[PDB]
Design a protein around this ligand. Structure first.
Ligand SMILES: [Zn+2]
Lengths: 29, 21, 29, 21, 29, 21
C-alpha cells in the first residue's frame, strides 16, 4: 500500500477502497 | 483524528482501517 | 459545504457538482 | 478569476456558483 | 495540454488519458 | 523517473507520452 500523505478527497477515496462493504466514517477537525 | 494521523502525517493501511465502520 | 482551497481538477469537480444542469466555465489565468 | 478566488484563496459555495453558466 | 505539476493519482490519471489503448507504466522512486 | 520529470518538475504532453507502453 501507498505510504504517502493522504488528504481531503484522496483520503476519502482511500477509505472507500480499503474499507469496502464495511464503509467508513470521515470526521475531520 | 484521521487528518492528523493520515493527512498531515502518513498512515499505514492498518491505521487507515481504524476509520472503517 | 467544504471551506478549503480548491484547485485544478478539484476545483473543476466542485463546479461540476455545484452547477449541475447549468454547467460552468473554467477559465484559469 | 476563479483560481485567485477559490484556489489560492477559499471560496464559499456562493462564490463558486459565480462560475456556473 | 496542461503544463502543471502532476503528481500521485493525478499523474496516473494523466497517463491513462494520454496513453489510451497503449496503456502505461507507473514506476515511482 | 516520471516523478522527477512530471511531478516535481513540469512535463509536456510529449514527455508524458515517454511513459506509455
Ligand atoms: Zn488531488
Amino acid at each position: 500500500f501507498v505510504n504517502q500523505h493522504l488528504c481531503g478527497s484522496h483520503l476519502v477515496e482511500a477509505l472507500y477502497l480499503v474499507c469496502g462493504e464495511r464503509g467508513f466514517f470521515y470526521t475531520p477537525k | 483524528g484521521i487528518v492528523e494521523q493520515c493527512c498531515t502525517s502518513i498512515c499505514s493501511l492498518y491505521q487507515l482501517e481504524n476509520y472503517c465502520n
